[PDB]
Amino acid sequence: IQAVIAEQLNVDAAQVTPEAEFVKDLGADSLDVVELIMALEEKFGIEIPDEQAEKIVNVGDVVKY
Amino acid sequence: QSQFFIEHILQILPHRYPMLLVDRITELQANQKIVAYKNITFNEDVFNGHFPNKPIFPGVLIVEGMAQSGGFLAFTSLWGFDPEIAKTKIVAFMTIDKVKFRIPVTPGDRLEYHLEVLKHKGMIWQVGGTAQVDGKVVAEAELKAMIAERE
Amino acid sequence: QSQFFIEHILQILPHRYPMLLVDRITELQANQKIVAYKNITFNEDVFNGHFPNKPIFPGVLIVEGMAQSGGFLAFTSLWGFDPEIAKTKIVAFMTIDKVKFRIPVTPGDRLEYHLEVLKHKGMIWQVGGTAQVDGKVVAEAELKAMIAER
Amino acid sequence: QSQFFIEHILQILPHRYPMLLVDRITELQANQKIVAYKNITFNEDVFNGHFPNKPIFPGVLIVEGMAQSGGFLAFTSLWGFDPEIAKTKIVAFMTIDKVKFRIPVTPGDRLEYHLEVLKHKGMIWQVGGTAQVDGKVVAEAELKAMIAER
Amino acid sequence: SQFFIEHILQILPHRYPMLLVDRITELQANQKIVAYKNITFNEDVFNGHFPNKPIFPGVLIVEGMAQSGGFLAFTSLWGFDPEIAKTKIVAFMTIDKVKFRIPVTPGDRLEYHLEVLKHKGMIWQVGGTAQVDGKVVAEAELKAMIAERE
Amino acid sequence: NLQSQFFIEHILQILPHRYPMLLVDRITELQANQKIVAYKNITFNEDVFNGHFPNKPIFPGVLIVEGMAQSGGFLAFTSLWGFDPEIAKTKIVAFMTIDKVKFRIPVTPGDRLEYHLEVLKHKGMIWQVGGTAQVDGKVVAEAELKAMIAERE
Amino acid sequence: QSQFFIEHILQILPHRYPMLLVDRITELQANQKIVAYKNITFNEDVFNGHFPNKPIFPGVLIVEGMAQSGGFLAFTSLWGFDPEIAKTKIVAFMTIDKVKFRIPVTPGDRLEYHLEVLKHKGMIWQVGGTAQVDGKVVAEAELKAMIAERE
C-alpha cells in the first residue's frame, strides 16, 4: 500500500508516511489522484466511490479502507 | 446496429476534419470491445508532410484513431445513440502507455482498430488493444480517456 | 509486375495531391485489363464540400480515377514500368462516354477500378469498365485517350 | 431574376468548398437554358496536383461545373428562386454522355457553362451544352439528372 | 508583352497559396503593368473571410498589386530571365495611401493597374489602382527594393 | 465593464473572421477607446508558408497589417458594445484606408507577433488606429488604419 | 551551435507541412538534452477539427513534437549539424510509454519540448521528458527510437 503510493507519484516510500497529504505534501495532480485511486483498486480488488474518495486527504484516510 | 457508418460516427464523436480518423464501426459490444477502421488513401493532406516521396501514416495518428474508437465505445456505452448530449461532450486523452509500432501503414491500407475495455469508471475509460492491417498487428497501445463537458 | 503500390504509381503518373486518385494496382494485363482501387476516407478535404453532414465521393472523381487507372494500363502496355520514359509522355483524355452512377460511394468504401481495353491502335486507347464497392457496380464509364510527347 | 451571384448560388446548391464550381449565373431562361461561369485562378488547391509546374483545370471538374449549372436550371425552372424548397430537394445526377475535351483550361480563364434543356419529363432532366473560354468551345457534355426529396 | 501563369511562376518565387497574379496582359518596361487575378469561390481564403459572405480581403488586393509591381520592376531591368530571377527578391519596404472602395467577390476579375512613380537603381516606387469591370475597387502606393536572394 | 485579457474563444465570439483569416490568438491588454495589445503566434504549421516562400518561411507583411486591423476592430467593437456576441453577429468592421506602413524586420516561424495599437481618432463608428507590430520588444512593422463599423446586412 | 532556427530544422528533419511540429531549438547538449518549442496558433488546420468552437492542441501531436525534438537531439549527437548525412538517415520511433496529459494546450501557447537522453547505445536511443507552457508541465512522455538508413 506504500510501495504503491510511492511508485504512482515518483517519490520514495520514505516520504510516504500516515502524515503525508497527497496534494499538499506529495504534490499529486488531479490526474495523479485519479490514477492512484485506480491503482489501489487494482492491487487488492476493491471499489471506492467518489462519494467516499473526495474526502480522502492523507494516506491514513485510505489505509483504513 | 451491426455496422455503424460515418453519418452515425459524426453524430457521436465531436472530432471533425482533419482530425476525425475513424470511418466505420464493424463491431461494438457495450462496455467490452469495439472493432472499427479507417481507410488510408494518398489523397490525405497529412501525406504532403509525412513524408515527401514516402507516404507513411504517422504512428501517433494510429493511436489517435484507437482513442476515437474507444471514445465511440464509451459515448455509446454510457448514453446510447444520443446525438444531443454528444454535442455537449468532449474527449480528453489522459494517459498513453505500452505503444509499439511494428509495421508501417501506407496508402491503400485498411487500418483496423481492435480495442477492449480494460477498466471503466464513470467518465474514465481505460482501453487497450492493437491496430491491424490485413490480419497483421501494425501497432499496440493502451490508453485512458476522460469524457468531459464542452461548457 | 502485377501489383503496384503507391510508390510505383507515383513514378508513372504525374498527378499529385489532391488529384491522384489511385492508391494501388492489384491486377494488370498488358493490352487487356487493369484492376486498381482508391480507399475512401472521411479524412479527405473533398468531403468538406460534398456535402456538409452527408459525405459522398463525387461521381466525376470516380471517373477520374478510372481514367488514371486506364492511362496506367495504356502507358504500361506500350513501355512497361519505365519511369524515365514516363517523364516524356502525357496521356491526354479526349472523350468520356456512357457514364452511369448507380450507387453512392462514401467513407469506408474501397473504390475498385475495373478497366478493359476496348480498342487500341497506336497512341489511341479506348478503355471501359466499372467502379466497384464490395462486388457491386457503383459506376460505369468508357474513355478515349491519346498518348503524346510531354 | 436572370443574374445570380455567389450568395444566391449558395442558397440553392448544397455544394461547398472545395466542390462549389459555379461562381456566377449570367442568364437563366426557365425550362430553356443557362449561362454560368467559374473563374479559374492559380490560387486553387486543385492546381497543387494537376499538375506541378503545369496548372491545368481537370476536365472532370469542368463537367461537374456543367452539372451544377444544369441542376440550378432544373431547380429554378420548377420552383424559381426558393431557398426554403432548395433545402428539401436533391438534384441527383444519373448519367453523363458525349463528353469531349478540346482545349485545356488554365489559371486566368473565365470558364463559361452553356447548358440547354434537351428533355424534361417528370423529375428527369436532360441537359447538354458546352464550356467556353473567350468564345471558344473547350469542352462539351450531356447530363441526365433526377430531382428527388432530401 | 502577354505573360501567362507558367511565365509568372518562372519570375516570382511566390507559390500557393500566396501567388495572387494569374496573368499579365500589358507590360511597358520602366513605365506600367496591367495584370489580373481571377476571384473564384473555390479559394481557401473564403472559408474564413467571411463564412456565408465571401469577400476577397483588402490586404490580398494590395499584395497582388505588390506582386505585379515586383514583376514590372524585375523584367524592366533583366527582361524575362528566369535564371537571374532565382537570385533576386523584390523586398517591399513601405505601403501608403491605401483606399478600399468596393468589395471584391467571387466571380470578379481583379485587375492591377500599376505605374512607375520613381525608379532609382534597385528602389522602385509604384502606385495605381485595382479594378473590377472598369471601376476602381482599391488604390495603393508601394515602395520596394530589389535585393539578392539570401 | 470590459476585462483586460481575452482568449481565443472570446475572440471567436466577437470577430466574424475564421480559419484561415483569423490572425489574432490572444489579447493581453485592452483599454476601451484607448489602446489594445494582442498577439499571434507564428508557427511553421501554417498553410501560408507553403507559398511564402518554399525553403524560406516568411510571414507576409500584409498579414501583419491584417492582424493589426483585426485587433483594432476588436477594440472598436468592444468599446462601443462591450463583450456582446449577439450584437457582434449583426455588425461588420469595414477596412477603409491604410497609411504609413513600414516593414523593418522579417517575421518567421517561432516568433510571437505582438500587435500594439492605440486610438488616434474616434468619431462615432469611424476608428483611426495606429501602432506597431513587435517581436521580442523590437518594432517589426508600423501601420495606420481607418475602419468603419456598419451592418453585416 | 546551440540555437537552431526553422531553416536549420528543415535541413535535418524530413518532416514537412503539416507534420513538422518543431519551430525552434533554443538549447542542445550532445548526448544529454534538448529544449525546443512550437508556437500554437489558431491559424492551424488541426483546429478546424479538434474541436469546432473549442480549439485544443491534440495530445498525440504534443507527443509527435517531442519525438521530433528527440530525433533532432539523437541525430546531431552522432553527426552534428550535417544536412548531407541527414538526407541518408531516419530516426524511427518504435515505442512510446508513460505519457500523461495534465493541462490542455490552446491557441496562443508556446509549447516547449524538454527532452533528455535516458539511454543511448549506437543507433538505439531512449529519450524522455516533458512538454511545458509558461513553466508548467502540460505533458510528459518517454520514447525509444532506432536510427536507420533512409529508404
Ligand SMILES: *P(=O)(O)OCC(C)(C)[C@H](O)C(=O)NCCC(=O)NCCS
Ligand atoms: P482533474 O479531474 O482536474 O483531471 C484533469 C484532467 C484529467 C481533465 C487533465 O489533467 C486535464 O486537465 N487535461 C488533459 C488535457 C489533454 O488531454 N490534452 C490533450 C488534448 S486531446
